[PDB]
Amino acid sequence: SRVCQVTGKRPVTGNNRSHALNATKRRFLPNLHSHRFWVESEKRFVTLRVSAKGMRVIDKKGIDTVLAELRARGEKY
Amino acid sequence: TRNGRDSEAKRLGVKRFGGESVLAGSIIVRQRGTKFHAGANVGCGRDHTLFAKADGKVKFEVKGPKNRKFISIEAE
Amino acid sequence: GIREKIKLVSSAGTGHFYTTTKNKRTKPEKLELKKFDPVVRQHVIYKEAKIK
Amino acid sequence: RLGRGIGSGLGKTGGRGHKGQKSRSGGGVRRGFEGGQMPLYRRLPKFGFTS
Amino acid sequence: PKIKTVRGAAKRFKKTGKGGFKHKHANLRHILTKKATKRKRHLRPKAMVSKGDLGLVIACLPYA
RNA sequence: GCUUGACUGCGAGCGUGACGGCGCGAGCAGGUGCGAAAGCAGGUCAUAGUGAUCCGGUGGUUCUGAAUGGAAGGGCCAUC
RNA sequence: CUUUAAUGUUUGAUGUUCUAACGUUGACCCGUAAUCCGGGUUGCGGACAGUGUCUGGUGGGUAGUUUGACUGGGGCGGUCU
């Protein structure tokens, strides 16, 4: 499903407004993108489904550090 | 049709009759045009409404060349 | 209705004003009148202004 | 005890009259209803503040 | 449950010493210029609630 | 002819409305105008020329100001 | 200042030459007894396409509703202060 593998962002629901404030249910989905991240330690490319906000934290945190937290959650690669 | 229109009645006429005791400021008659004219101790409003300027009995009388009807207050 | 309402502002600077109407086709000149000002408790000249 | 025979004086209508809102089950208008007009506590303007 | 006061009526009526309710006069919002000064002056002071509407006001204001 | 009473604060007592309300008002206070004065003037001979509340706008205001000083905002007055 | 021309300074607009993101419902290899999927090799495309947020337009495609009363029945006409 539409879940970020780094930040865990998932679709959320809200209202479409209008000039008359009429509220209709809607969904907000993350800006998810499938990217192949280069992991130096394994000298390999690993593909992750990440949001655009997740991409920013990867540079700040390091490719190895983020993957270590994901392994704590536990998943396939 | 193009008719069938009217306005609410404004309740004109004599409110206090001859010999009635009235308080100062009480209107005696509401009218259109000077059917009655103000006499002694009687005021005239901007719409020719006659009001009492003193406490006393209402008296109607006819005097003058025009054979008009006048309202006066005898303040005892 | 084409006559438009105007305000007459006192010259004393109290900020009190009266309101009235005036004909725009004629009498272009501003309206000046001596009217009582409750703030100064005196009759002063009131000057035409714009309602806003 | 209404609606318990002729002799009781409140039978066959329960004191509710004849086929009005008050005679309906759960019937009756809300507080302040003036027949359709906006009620007096809405014809008049708000004033003041709470200190 | 506790009775809920009509909040719209609570912002326009205040209880007086003898149990009455005072309200401000209407007709003095935005067409007042064409009204004579005497008319505006009489509408400025506070007014008493009429006897016919006393029952309706008390129903809307059960806690005051 | 001269003028702005088409005045400000009020108002005894009445009228008419179920009510909201509408209408009339001597007189009082402060300041005016016209008269030599008595006096008259709170618009127009009178009765049509009009629209409640909410919301928002403008001016004024030592009323309020969520720790305190302000302020925002609100209130009041004028007014759209 | 106008008509402007050149000159210095800034965002963009297309076009192109790229590949490295991204795309490949091109080829080949492997997982593999597999027209799926994944990985690899290669070709092509390529900072587009495509998607997310925001935003303008369009939208009976699909919804929720409105569409007054009086009235010699109703509608039509007329009327509403």
Next chain:
RNA sequence: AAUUCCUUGUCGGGUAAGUUCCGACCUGCACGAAUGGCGUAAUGAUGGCCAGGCUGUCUCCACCCGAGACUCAGUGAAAUUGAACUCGCUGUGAAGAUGCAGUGUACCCGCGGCAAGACGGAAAGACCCCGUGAACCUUUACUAUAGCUUGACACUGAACAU
């Protein structure tokens, strides 16, 4: 004219007599060319009209054969029903009377029949109206919205040319 209101248009044909049919007229109230026009063999439980044959369709019904209806034995319902000692007439009367008034008539009770009435039975009227009822459907009704489309930003980086 599957279209013509006036209208049974007018003329002709058909009939003893044709508001239909067929042929024309054009005055097309208010035909008309792919929301197709005009024709068209064949086809049609297709629509209209005519003729022959044929006949109880009818003039005008008669008889006969069966199955019911009728009687006996056995078994044995139903809809409906405020209660009935449940006549006619005229008048009255939620304004069309078995029940009121007046008056007339009528011994008590079955069976076979007919349906004039009991505003007969059936089903809280489908027409009409109303409710600030319901639902579907339409659209340049309102307010939205899926979808489609536009641009900015992100995914998305580096040279060159104008």
Next chain:
RNA sequence: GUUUAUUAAAAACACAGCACUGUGCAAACACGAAAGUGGACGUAUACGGUGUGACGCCUGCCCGGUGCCGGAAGGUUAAUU
């Protein structure tokens, strides 16, 4: 030939044919939040949609309105800055 099973079988629908239009194949389109599937294991001599309705003779005039298509100079105009 088909149709209102249970009051309507028709002049209605379908029909072969005709024309317009969309669609270059990761096709348009449709079903699916998506993946995907149908279209089609087809490729414009194909497919979808629309109207007309064998055949015969033919199908005239209007692009103002409403749509659609093409253009983009100017006017106006969102998010953003």
Next chain:
RNA sequence: AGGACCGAACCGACUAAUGUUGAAAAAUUAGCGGAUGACUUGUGGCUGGGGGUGAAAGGCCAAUCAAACCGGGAGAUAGCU
């Protein structure tokens, strides 16, 4: 050769009568149409309710269809009787 002809099975259901507390909650009798085909039929399978399916009648989707049935919101609401 033929969505050819006549005509049984088979399938349809045009007319009339009966029946309408039916023999039968749609049939029977006498006629009627198709009857090698766009036929008919058996056994399985698939499409699900604002959806399906429909040679299109708002038809059909378990004797129910201008939005199936069952349960729930729910003692909806009902200025009406």
Next chain:
RNA sequence: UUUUGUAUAAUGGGUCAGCGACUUAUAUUCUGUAGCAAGGUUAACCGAAUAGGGGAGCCGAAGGGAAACCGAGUCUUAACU
């Protein structure tokens, strides 16, 4: 039963028996009644516990004003006889 009006040929009922419709909770106002009284009364809770404790609070004895404020006065107004 519903109506201006029903023997009405307006609705209802074949009959009997059983069942079948103004309740409950909370708050508020008014009346009656009882207690205390310028005071009245506790709630949760404690508690061998329908007692007692708990006065946290609530209403009343002072109002006027939008409010600040003032106060048997107060507001309105420059000021009110």
Next chain:
RNA sequence: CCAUAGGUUAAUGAGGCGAACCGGGGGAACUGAAACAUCUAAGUACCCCGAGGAAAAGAAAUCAACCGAGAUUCCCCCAG
């Protein structure tokens, strides 16, 4: 090419059921507004996930107001 993916064993653990209560992911409409859009109904009904005997919450980047209080939960007031 190492590797990695993958593959074969062996150990543990989980699968389902069950009334309500609880947390979380989704989430109506009828209705009320005497219509109806904001609003109400209602984060209710319902669906889904998970846990326990309770769950959840919980040890101040909290309140107060220049005095102070000192986690969370629950009850009565404050207060319609």
